Amino acid sequence: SNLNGKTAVVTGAASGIGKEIALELAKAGAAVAIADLNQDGANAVADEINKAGGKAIGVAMDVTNEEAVNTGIDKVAEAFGSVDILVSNAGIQIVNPIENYSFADWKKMQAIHVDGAFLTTKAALKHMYKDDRGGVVIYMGSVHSHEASPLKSAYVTAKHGLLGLARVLAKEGAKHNVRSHVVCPGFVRTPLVDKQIPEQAKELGISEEEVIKKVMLGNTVDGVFTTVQDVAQTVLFLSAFPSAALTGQSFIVSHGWFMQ
Template sequence: MAMQIPAPLAGKAALVTGAGRGIGRGIAVELARQGADVALVDVSDGGLAEVADEITGMGSKTTTFVADVSDRDAVFAAVDHAASALGGFDVMVNNAGIALVGPIADVTPDDLARLWAINVDGVLWGIQAAVAKFKELGRPGKIINASSIAGHEGFAMLGPYSATKFAVRALTQAAAKEHAADGITVNAYCPGVVGTDMWVEIDRRFAQLTGVAEGETFKKFTETIALGRPETPEDVAGFVAYLAGPGADYMTGQAGLIDGGMVYR
């Protein structure tokens, strides 16, 4: 009789922010497929019930929580809820983020404040909340942050967005150094052109600002991908699941590119 190999993330409890759609949804589903119980967090409950049903159908436990990641108290509350509802806490995926498309010259203080609050502050609060919970539970843990190809190379018309993703890499490196002795690893994932609602909006904004037809910007970026196709949430999710699993136990402070071959570092 063949020996059954346990799922890589069996017995682990994870939290994913921005889990209601797009990359976050893909990550949550993949973590569950690999055996994890998953807390789904988003700024609204739209889409969360559907993702929860999919995860429950796989046999994993799940719970949902509505929180704005720019609100530090809300992020801490989400982590507390996840640990209580799932009976533990092992993996924090700081995935939630927004884009801002436009010339640097046109950026307003309000634009920048909102972008920074979600993309950078939200990651920082997630790191803090996860570290506090790991220490409270007396166990090691994994923190995985959303950066981007724009965290390795600044892109025209995406200047402030790129700056936030560079900042995520800095936080990832610093947190990895500060918490290695606690048994906590901190890494980031850097997607490229993913076929999600965010890229639909990026493409639409490029069309408005440059006069090109809608779809042309997405097509232009896709044509630079060595593997010849746009990225899917599942492409990203497979890498995040690796970072969450035992194969990445000796990896920390890194920001891995998962972009099909666009940016090379």
């Protein structure tokens, strides 16, 4: 997998999965624009890449805003000459049962996860469709693109929706040499998780080990957290694939949680 001469935009990439994707794509030779609401956050990642010998810039962008997305993607295209790869990535999670789920929270969840994917896609296609130069568009989904959990109606709905948009893009983008994919990570261990574990142990009245192995990773086959590296490697594989053979497909990266 080599991306020398390629240009990539990764959104929500100041941290976590999106940051590791950015790092991995740059390592592979891609020139990478790290887009995030926080320009300083984006810059820190870009600075890490440049220090390691790669090529990156940080781009401030509210992905729910058409104007900010269009301008920012065009800025990338101007700096780098193209946009070969778009990775649309958001991780914001707001939980609540449906009967208590705020409509404001609901709308913000759809806007960030899905409108952000729609807008950045639309903006990237303006450049990818030019003379059918082509491109790869990857949405970061979840096992929750495929399977539900209680208290996560907004997130599960959004992640399900991302599959539909990607599948339409695969049929529309083919004649312009644009491929689409969805990558669906399982449970990643975070500082938040580290705090949620003892909480749920006390509330449920079981051990923290049972919270990890049975509550959180009970649907995995091995009781192992998914790593950002797992995810980034799969994105790299897709980004560098030599044909459109995998277009429209989703890839579940979850240690056996939901098997398709």
